[PDB]
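Notebook B, p. 112. Complex prediction, attempt 2.
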Amino acid sequence: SPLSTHVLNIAQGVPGANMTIVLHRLDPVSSAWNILTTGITNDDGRCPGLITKENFIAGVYKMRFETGKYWDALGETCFYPYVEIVFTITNTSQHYHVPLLLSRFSYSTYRGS
Amino acid sequence: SPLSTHVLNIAQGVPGANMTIVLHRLDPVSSAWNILTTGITNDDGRCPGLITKENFIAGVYKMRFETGKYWDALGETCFYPYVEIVFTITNTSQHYHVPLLLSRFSYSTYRGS
Amino acid sequence: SPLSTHVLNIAQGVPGANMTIVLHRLDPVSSAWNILTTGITNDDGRCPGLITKENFIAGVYKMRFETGKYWDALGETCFYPYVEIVFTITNTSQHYHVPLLLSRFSYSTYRGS
Amino acid sequence: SPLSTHVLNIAQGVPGANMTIVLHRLDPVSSAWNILTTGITNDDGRCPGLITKENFIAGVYKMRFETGKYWDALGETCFYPYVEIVFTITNTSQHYHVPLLLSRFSYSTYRGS
């Protein structure tokens, strides 16, 4: 709304709760990143209100998931210290859902609406 | 050996050929990434000779897949301009396989050996 | 409610619309599968009304997805003529989400709720 | 050769060893399945000798992975008592690799070679 996520712990068949997510946007002129917001997934593994419609401008975004910290808080290690999903937003009339299905040794993502 | 990849175009059920892959390593001390190697996947979607045993030391690595340029060359667009998989190497006795299963609107990876 | 699905065409980045889905349940003792409900996905790739809470008993269920016919209607072939996901329900106090993430040459599913 | 598989336990990031696999092929006049071969994956998670080149005719095949029995022999429960992958072979000149990425609550499959 207009950007949502869902973190899923597919090793346990439950949502990934309390994972830190940091949203960034690429600066159009330099190659650098602006932090837009930092969230934490709720018990349903979601992060409501990541961005407002007015600030969700077209461009290139990056969602960093703190997978290493998540798994560590469950007392286990992860192959990935963090996961960054980088994606292009051009059509701003649509909803964009960028989930993360995660184990300690795998991850997947897809574009949802 | 000891780091390998495999790009799979799961939209067409064929390997991802001619995709640029760049391997980086995080430098202990400075919080900077530095390029170790660049490669281009062959027809089987693999990139032999990414790194030698002597240089495959423990640390944090990142493999950047140019998914945007790959799909642009197939005359299609990608949700992801590029994919970076960041991973921790501590046990240097093992072989690490870091594949990319890719469509225009999704991707996934797992730790293989 | 209490069983749902979600079909996502990850090759095209859109919900899987108008896919026929059939829920079956295995009759304990006999080896007999029989139809519980036949449905079709709506515009958002979802299929409400799969089973009533009253009829949601512990047992083995199977959701059959007509992927071949789905792709055929899109003018493309599928590697899988249909997909059956078989699962065991023992805890009838929960909601079970059984999505299907589909391309022409791949699929995945996970337990959600 | 010409049909192969690879089972990966992505929950633990090791190969799916000692899993029972059953290959069937659909009888093209009745709508019923003929058992071709039953095998067990090796320590690498693979299962060589699934079918001979001679017996590899065009048709509909089905690979049943006994996931529930895999997990139980490991002291764990699986949401799926088994996984069957049904696929159409039309081009008999190609090799078909159909691996299974598995956890207790998720699985995915894709065409390779």
